[PDB]
């Protein structure tokens, strides 16, 4: 469903931007859903149908003679810049941010969620160009971690006086 501060990212971790939270996968894993990561198959064949080949994409059989196998985005997504994004985000550019879904209305619609420090700018097609502060909501319950701004996103990381599996 919708990722919150209480979502348990299976084989991933929580990140926060200006208008949403989402799970970020570990290693070279890919998203099978909003809160689950798995290994990515490298070649789609009859042995890898339905297995994940990317974020919100899995191998599927394509009809025809001869039949083929390819990495296709899940229902509700399409391939844009080699990544599966929601249909509502197809022609969307957010700037220093991401296009996410607003699902609060019967008609789902795409909005922008920005890197920490920016908010959508009504004077710039709602792109992530306006300065704005975002308070971090992450619960970094590990006794040695706190919320830090890493590469423009909020993320539980080692505190100001520790480094790297426990933060020590």
């Amino acid at each position, epitope marked *: 469903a919708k990722v919150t501060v209480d979502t348990v990212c299976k084989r991933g971790f929580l990140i926060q931007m200006s208008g949403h939270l989402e799970c970020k996968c570990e290693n070279d894993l890919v998203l099978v859903n909003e809160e689950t990561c798995e290994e990515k198959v490298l070649k789609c064949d009859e042995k890898t149908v339905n297995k994940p080949c990317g974020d919100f994409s899995k191998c599927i059989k394509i009809d025809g003679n001869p039949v083929s196998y390819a990495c296709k985005c899940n229902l509700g997504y399409d391939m844009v810049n080699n990544v599966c994004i929601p249909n509502e985000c*197809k*022609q969307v550019t957010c700037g220093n941010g991401k296009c996410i879904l607003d699902t609060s*209305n*019967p*008609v789902k619609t795409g909005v922008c969620s920005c890197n920490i420090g920016k908010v959508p700018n009504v004077q710039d097609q709602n792109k992530c160009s306006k300065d704005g502060e975002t308070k971090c909501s992450l619960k970094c319950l590990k006794e040695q971690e706190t919320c830090k701004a890493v590469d423009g996103i909020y993320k539980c990381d080692c505190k100001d006086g520790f480094i790297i599996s426990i933060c020590t």
Partner: antibody
Amino acid sequence: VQLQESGPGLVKPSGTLSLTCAVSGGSISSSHWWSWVRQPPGKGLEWVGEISLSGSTHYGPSLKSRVSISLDKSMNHFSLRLSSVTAADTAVYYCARESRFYGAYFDYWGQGTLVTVSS
Amino acid sequence: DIQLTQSPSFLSASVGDRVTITCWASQGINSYLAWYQQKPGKTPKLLIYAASTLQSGVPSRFSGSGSGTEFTLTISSLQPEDFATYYCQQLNSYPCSFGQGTTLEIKR
């Protein structure tokens, strides 16, 4: 990206109105939703219907079971079909690309074509 | 369904005047209200979406405001080419609907 309607401009009463919207200068897959809008003479804009790239259709309830919309991804166009037409269907019909970015609206429109219902 | 009602139906203002069109929704649609400009017998042109977000290529004298069931379109300094019929539009839930239109005459 250019939108261009075409089709017969004169339909006899109870006949079938048939129009096609050809997309050029770009793919019809640039957006996932496409719509038809009409405007009877001197009246306001009316939403006729909508289709998605996956074939999902939604229609104006006023048109009941008389309206249908198809899409041909290979031909880069989509069509409108309205049956059992009366003079109340005389209107300029626009096709529009839908954008669903902070709402759901029509960012690209066609020239608009007039269809008069008369014998 | 969601009905949109615009006020006034007709409006006459002079070059340089500030004009405000009102669109009322029968039930709340958050800020997801769009505005169109249509010259007589011409293709409608998208001006504003999300109540107040100006579409690219639209002059800054156009602005919008509102949320819920009451919205406003404002032209801060009327220009001669600003005469048209203006329509609000929503598609927050099917079916899509328009206002009946506000016709703006340039007074001289």
